[PDB]
Write an enzyme that holds these catalytic residues in place. Structure first.
Site, PDB file in Angstrom:
ATOM      1  N   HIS A 295       0.917  -1.098   0.000  1.00 29.31           N
ATOM      2  CA  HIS A 295       0.000   0.000   0.000  1.00 29.31           C
ATOM      3  C   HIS A 295       0.952   1.140   0.000  1.00 29.31           C
ATOM      4  CE1 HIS A 295      -3.908  -1.808   0.892  1.00 29.31           C
ATOM      5  NE2 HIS A 295      -3.321  -2.616   1.763  1.00 29.31           N
TER       6      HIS A 295
ATOM      7  N   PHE B  14       0.638   4.202  -0.280  1.00 33.72           N
ATOM      8  CA  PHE B  14       0.204   5.324   0.583  1.00 33.72           C
ATOM      9  C   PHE B  14       0.051   4.901   2.059  1.00 33.72           C
ATOM     10  CE2 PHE B  14      -3.293   7.776   2.647  1.00 33.72           C
ATOM     11  CZ  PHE B  14      -2.524   8.937   2.910  1.00 33.72           C
ATOM     12  N   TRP B  15      -0.807   3.928   2.320  1.00 29.34           N
ATOM     13  CA  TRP B  15      -1.157   3.615   3.693  1.00 29.34           C
ATOM     14  C   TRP B  15       0.016   3.097   4.511  1.00 29.34           C
ATOM     15  CZ3 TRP B  15      -4.585   5.975   6.379  1.00 29.34           C
ATOM     16  CH2 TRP B  15      -5.763   6.452   5.773  1.00 29.34           C
TER      17      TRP B  15
ATOM     18  N   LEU C 153     -15.228  11.226   0.847  1.00 30.28           N
ATOM     19  CA  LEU C 153     -14.054  11.184  -0.010  1.00 30.28           C
ATOM     20  C   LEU C 153     -14.531  10.748  -1.423  1.00 30.28           C
ATOM     21  CD1 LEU C 153     -10.998  11.069  -0.621  1.00 30.28           C
ATOM     22  CD2 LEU C 153     -11.013   8.653   0.166  1.00 30.28           C
ATOM     23  N   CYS C 154     -14.198  11.506  -2.452  1.00 30.78           N
ATOM     24  CA  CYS C 154     -14.719  11.161  -3.750  1.00 30.78           C
ATOM     25  C   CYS C 154     -13.796  11.804  -4.788  1.00 30.78           C
ATOM     26  CB  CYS C 154     -16.099  11.792  -3.883  1.00 30.78           C
ATOM     27  SG  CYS C 154     -16.929  11.438  -5.443  1.00 30.78           S
ATOM     28  N   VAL C 155     -13.340  11.015  -5.769  1.00 24.69           N
ATOM     29  CA  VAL C 155     -12.582  11.495  -6.882  1.00 24.69           C
ATOM     30  C   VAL C 155     -13.434  11.260  -8.137  1.00 24.69           C
ATOM     31  CG1 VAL C 155     -10.566  10.896  -8.356  1.00 24.69           C
ATOM     32  CG2 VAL C 155     -10.292  11.284  -5.787  1.00 24.69           C
TER      33      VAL C 155
ATOM     34  N   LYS D 190      -5.257   7.701 -10.310  1.00 26.62           N
ATOM     35  CA  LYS D 190      -4.190   8.651 -10.606  1.00 26.62           C
ATOM     36  C   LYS D 190      -3.571   9.197  -9.287  1.00 26.62           C
ATOM     37  CE  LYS D 190      -6.527  10.178 -14.971  1.00 26.62           C
ATOM     38  NZ  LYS D 190      -6.542   8.863 -15.719  1.00 26.62           N
TER      39      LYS D 190
ATOM     40  N   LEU E  91      -4.796  10.629  -6.706  1.00 25.05           N
ATOM     41  CA  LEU E  91      -5.333  11.875  -6.137  1.00 25.05           C
ATOM     42  C   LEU E  91      -5.906  11.661  -4.686  1.00 25.05           C
ATOM     43  CD1 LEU E  91      -6.219  15.072  -6.623  1.00 25.05           C
ATOM     44  CD2 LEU E  91      -7.550  14.054  -8.523  1.00 25.05           C
TER      45      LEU E  91
ATOM     46  N   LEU F  23     -22.786   8.706   8.768  1.00 22.33           N
ATOM     47  CA  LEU F  23     -23.855   9.072   7.812  1.00 22.33           C
ATOM     48  C   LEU F  23     -23.446   8.661   6.392  1.00 22.33           C
ATOM     49  CD1 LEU F  23     -24.811  12.571   9.146  1.00 22.33           C
ATOM     50  CD2 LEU F  23     -25.861  10.369   9.703  1.00 22.33           C
TER      51      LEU F  23
HETATM   52  C1  LIG Z   1      -5.945  13.535  12.119  1.00 21.67           C
HETATM   53  C2  LIG Z   1      -6.813  13.796  10.899  1.00 21.67           C
HETATM   54  C3  LIG Z   1      -6.694  12.586   9.906  1.00 21.67           C
HETATM   55  C4  LIG Z   1      -7.578  12.919   8.702  1.00 21.67           C
HETATM   56  C5  LIG Z   1      -7.619  11.834   7.581  1.00 21.67           C
HETATM   57  C6  LIG Z   1      -7.885  10.453   8.173  1.00 21.67           C
HETATM   58  C7  LIG Z   1      -7.877   9.291   7.144  1.00 21.67           C
HETATM   59  C8  LIG Z   1      -9.124   9.447   6.207  1.00 21.67           C
HETATM   60  C9  LIG Z   1      -9.003   8.332   5.159  1.00 21.67           C
HETATM   61  C10 LIG Z   1     -10.103   8.405   4.080  1.00 21.67           C
HETATM   62  C11 LIG Z   1     -11.416   7.852   4.692  1.00 21.67           C
HETATM   63  C12 LIG Z   1     -12.552   7.804   3.634  1.00 21.67           C
HETATM   64  C13 LIG Z   1     -13.937   7.376   4.177  1.00 21.67           C
HETATM   65  C14 LIG Z   1     -14.937   7.340   3.018  1.00 21.67           C
HETATM   66  O1  LIG Z   1     -15.321   8.425   2.550  1.00 21.67           O
HETATM   67  S1  LIG Z   1     -15.383   5.841   2.393  1.00 21.67           S
HETATM   68  C15 LIG Z   1     -16.066   6.249   0.779  1.00 21.67           C
HETATM   69  C16 LIG Z   1     -14.926   6.466  -0.223  1.00 21.67           C
HETATM   70  N1  LIG Z   1     -15.531   6.904  -1.492  1.00 21.67           N
HETATM   71  C17 LIG Z   1     -15.956   6.141  -2.533  1.00 21.67           C
HETATM   72  O2  LIG Z   1     -15.746   4.907  -2.519  1.00 21.67           O
HETATM   73  C18 LIG Z   1     -16.543   6.889  -3.747  1.00 21.67           C
HETATM   74  C19 LIG Z   1     -16.199   6.206  -5.104  1.00 21.67           C
HETATM   75  N2  LIG Z   1     -14.728   6.104  -5.231  1.00 21.67           N
HETATM   76  C20 LIG Z   1     -13.852   7.109  -5.369  1.00 21.67           C
HETATM   77  O3  LIG Z   1     -14.203   8.306  -5.397  1.00 21.67           O
HETATM   78  C21 LIG Z   1     -12.384   6.739  -5.498  1.00 21.67           C
HETATM   79  O4  LIG Z   1     -12.253   5.369  -5.915  1.00 21.67           O
HETATM   80  C22 LIG Z   1     -11.615   6.883  -4.152  1.00 21.67           C
HETATM   81  C23 LIG Z   1     -11.531   8.367  -3.720  1.00 21.67           C
HETATM   82  C24 LIG Z   1     -12.275   6.035  -3.042  1.00 21.67           C
HETATM   83  C25 LIG Z   1     -10.206   6.327  -4.353  1.00 21.67           C
HETATM   84  O5  LIG Z   1      -9.581   7.111  -5.396  1.00 21.67           O
HETATM   85  P1  LIG Z   1      -8.943   6.254  -6.627  1.00 21.67           P
HETATM   86  O6  LIG Z   1      -9.723   5.010  -6.919  1.00 21.67           O
HETATM   87  O7  LIG Z   1      -8.845   7.283  -7.755  1.00 21.67           O
HETATM   88  O8  LIG Z   1      -7.506   5.712  -6.100  1.00 21.67           O
HETATM   89  P2  LIG Z   1      -6.176   6.621  -6.049  1.00 21.67           P
HETATM   90  O9  LIG Z   1      -5.222   6.072  -7.071  1.00 21.67           O
HETATM   91  O10 LIG Z   1      -6.528   8.065  -6.148  1.00 21.67           O
HETATM   92  O11 LIG Z   1      -5.601   6.294  -4.587  1.00 21.67           O
HETATM   93  C26 LIG Z   1      -5.162   4.994  -4.213  1.00 21.67           C
HETATM   94  C27 LIG Z   1      -5.083   4.899  -2.692  1.00 21.67           C
HETATM   95  O12 LIG Z   1      -6.312   5.210  -2.003  1.00 21.67           O
HETATM   96  C28 LIG Z   1      -6.616   4.185  -1.086  1.00 21.67           C
HETATM   97  N3  LIG Z   1      -8.098   4.118  -0.991  1.00 21.67           N
HETATM   98  C29 LIG Z   1      -8.960   3.570  -1.877  1.00 21.67           C
HETATM   99  N4  LIG Z   1     -10.204   3.718  -1.355  1.00 21.67           N
HETATM  100  C30 LIG Z   1     -10.072   4.337  -0.152  1.00 21.67           C
HETATM  101  C31 LIG Z   1     -10.931   4.705   0.857  1.00 21.67           C
HETATM  102  N5  LIG Z   1     -12.267   4.561   0.726  1.00 21.67           N
HETATM  103  N6  LIG Z   1     -10.456   5.354   1.934  1.00 21.67           N
HETATM  104  C32 LIG Z   1      -9.139   5.542   2.135  1.00 21.67           C
HETATM  105  N7  LIG Z   1      -8.285   5.159   1.225  1.00 21.67           N
HETATM  106  C33 LIG Z   1      -8.741   4.600   0.056  1.00 21.67           C
HETATM  107  C34 LIG Z   1      -6.058   2.925  -1.745  1.00 21.67           C
HETATM  108  O13 LIG Z   1      -5.866   1.848  -0.810  1.00 21.67           O
HETATM  109  C35 LIG Z   1      -4.761   3.482  -2.317  1.00 21.67           C
HETATM  110  O14 LIG Z   1      -3.668   3.657  -1.404  1.00 21.67           O
HETATM  111  P3  LIG Z   1      -2.537   2.513  -1.241  1.00 21.67           P
HETATM  112  O15 LIG Z   1      -3.271   1.127  -0.986  1.00 21.67           O
HETATM  113  O16 LIG Z   1      -1.666   2.630  -2.542  1.00 21.67           O
HETATM  114  O17 LIG Z   1      -1.671   2.719   0.097  1.00 21.67           O
END
Ligand SMILES: CCCCCCCCCCCCCC(=O)SCCNC(=O)CCNC(=O)[C@H](O)C(C)(C)COP(=O)(O)OP(=O)(O)OC[C@H]1O[C@@H](n2cnc3c(N)ncnc32)[C@H](O)[C@@H]1OP(=O)(O)O
Ligand SMILES: O=C1CS[C@H](c2ccc3[nH]ncc3c2)N1Cc1ccccc1
Length: 411
Positions: free
Chosen positions: A2, A4-5, A159-161, A168, A170, A411
């Site tokens: 991962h 990123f993570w 979270l939504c791209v 990509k 993002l 929610l």
């Molecule tokens: C102290 C304050 C802290 C604040 C922040 C706290 C953390 C908040 C964390 C977020 C909490 C969100 C809670 C909700 O809203 S959960 C709902 C999430 N939204 C959706 O599923 C809507 C439809 N999908 C999309 O818009 C995109 O597919 C998303 C944005 C999900 C991924 O965009 P994309 O498909 O274009 O991929 P990438 O190439 O840009 O990015 C790849 C990386 O992203 C990791 N990934 C994939 N899905 C998720 C996910 N749901 N949470 C966290 N990470 C996710 C993935 O393992 C990979 O990293 P790695 O495996 O290479 O390491």
């Protein structure tokens, strides 16, 4: 791996979190002054935008992005269609921080391309009861209790791209900038949920659905006519009969919640949620915000006996676009929200939730097996669905708990 993570302060494997015994921060302690004051660099064709989630046109912009690009089921039959009024409700609770609503737009035309939102929550998130027990056996009680006090943290959602910009990388950028903005407010933890498996959940629960309009649900292929309805004569009449509900609530005393109910609802809710290991703490202002009825958004009913509120339930509305289908555009779903029963069994209270929802035109009532939601599944005819909802902390070591030890509705 991962990419990123693996760079983040979360446990990395199911194996790390099975070993965790005390609640506590993962990262190095840091200060607001350590945190970069300027937004994370992004490509020059893009810019960061803090939408004004009380400007109808900015809400509308977010609304459209999520309508077209937010979460779908695994078969791409449904996509959430959170309403503008719902988004304003969810994103602007009391003392919300406008800077925690983070968008990326294309510099040229201001086309919105990505979003993530944080809101404040006060959460109990100290060591769970069963670990606190081990801790005692072992003389380690003060360690176990160090982080018992409710913490003001961030709740991340939405979270939504844009579908065009997917894969990509993002999403890491959105998450880093959200993390910066929250840290600059001197907040170091977040809680979030997702249907997908990431490193690493502290809890996971199945979804449950309760058919209210089975003819529509079958027609949109959310439900099937199970193969036992086969050796029956005319299946759809039987199915409708199986899920039929009274036209009016059964608990005398039931009515919609009123602003003057706020202190009593708060008390019976806090008394209840306080029994779970992880759960929020709400002021009167937060109880009014999250629970007072709001048209097409949240629906809350109290049981009042002897001019006293002794029980209540709430549900909220999220329609879903039905993606394939001829006949239907929208699925009208109710989600069980918070509740408390002190005078009646939980199944008799939640039956009135189903009756109300059905009577107001909802097609299905959904929930996750948190709180004591498992206690009424069978009697109220809920069935386990496909997804698991996984609960996560950012920057917080937390032992694995069951979802029935979770009292935070997301929610
Ligand atoms: C102290 C304050 C802290 C604040 C922040 C706290 C953390 C908040 C964390 C977020 C909490 C969100 C809670 C909700 O809203 S959960 C709902 C999430 N939204 C959706 O599923 C809507 C439809 N999908 C999309 O818009 C995109 O597919 C998303 C944005 C999900 C991924 O965009 P994309 O498909 O274009 O991929 P990438 O190439 O840009 O990015 C790849 C990386 O992203 C990791 N990934 C994939 N899905 C998720 C996910 N749901 N949470 C966290 N990470 C996710 C993935 O393992 C990979 O990293 P790695 O495996 O290479 O390491
Ligand atoms: O709109 C969406 C996109 S993903 C979510 C969903 C859909 C089907 C599901 N089965 N089990 C969980 C689950 C969640 N959902 C809401 C929903 C809930 C019940 C039926 C159809 C859609």
């Amino acid at each position: 791996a991962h990419a990123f993570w693996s760079t983040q302060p979360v446990p990395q494997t199911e194996d790390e979190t099975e070993k965790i015994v005390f609640a506590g921060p993962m990262d190095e302690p840091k200060t607001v002054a350590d945190i970069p004051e300027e937004p994370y660099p992004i490509a020059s064709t893009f810019e960061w935008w803090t939408p004004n989630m009380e400007a109808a046109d900015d809400i509308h912009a977010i609304y459209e992005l999520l309508r077209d690009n937010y979460v779908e089921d695994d078969d791409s039959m449904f996509r959430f269609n959170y309403s503008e009024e719902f988004l304003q409700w969810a994103l602007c609770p009391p003392n919300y921080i406008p800077d925690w609503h983070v968008a990326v737009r294309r510099k040229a035309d201001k086309k919105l391309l990505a979003f993530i939102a944080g809101v404040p929550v006060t959460l109990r998130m100290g060591t769970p009861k069963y670990m606190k027990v081990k801790a005692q056996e072992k003389g380690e009680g003060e360690e176990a209790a160090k982080y018992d006090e409710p913490r003001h943290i961030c709740e991340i959602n939405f979270l939504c791209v844009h579908k065009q910009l997917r894969e990509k990388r993002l999403a890491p950028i959105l998450i880093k900038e959200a993390t910066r903005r929250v840290n600059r407010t001197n907040v170091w933890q977040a809680v979030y949920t997702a249907g997908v498996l990431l490193p690493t959940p502290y809890a996971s629960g199945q979804y449950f659905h309760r058919s209210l309009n089975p003819e529509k649900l079958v027609e949109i292929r959310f439900s099937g006519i199970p193969a036992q309805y086969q050796k029956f004569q005319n299946p759809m009449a039987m199915l409708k009969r199986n899920y039929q509900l009274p036209s009016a609530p059964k608990n005398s005393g039931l009515r919609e919640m009123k602003p003057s109910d706020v202190p009593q609802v708060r008390r019976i809710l806090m008394n209840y949620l306080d029994s779970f290991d992880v759960g929020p703490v709400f002021s009167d202002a937060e109880i009014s915000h999250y629970l007072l009825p709001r048209d097409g958004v949240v629906f809350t009913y109290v049981v009042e006996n002897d001019k006293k509120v002794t029980d209540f339930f709430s549900f909220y509305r999220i329609p879903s676009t039905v993606i394939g289908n001829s006949n239907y555009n929208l699925l009208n779903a109710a989600y069980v929200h918070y509740y408390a029963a002190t005078s009646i069994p939980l199944h008799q209270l939640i039956l009135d939730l189903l009756i109300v929802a059905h009577s107001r035109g909802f097609d299905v009532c959904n929930m996750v097996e948190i709180l004591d939601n498992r206690s009424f599944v069978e009697q109220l005819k809920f069935g386990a669905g496909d997804g698991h909802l996984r609960y996560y902390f950012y920057n917080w070591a937390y032992p694995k708990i069951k979802p029935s030890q979770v009292a935070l509705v997301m929610l």
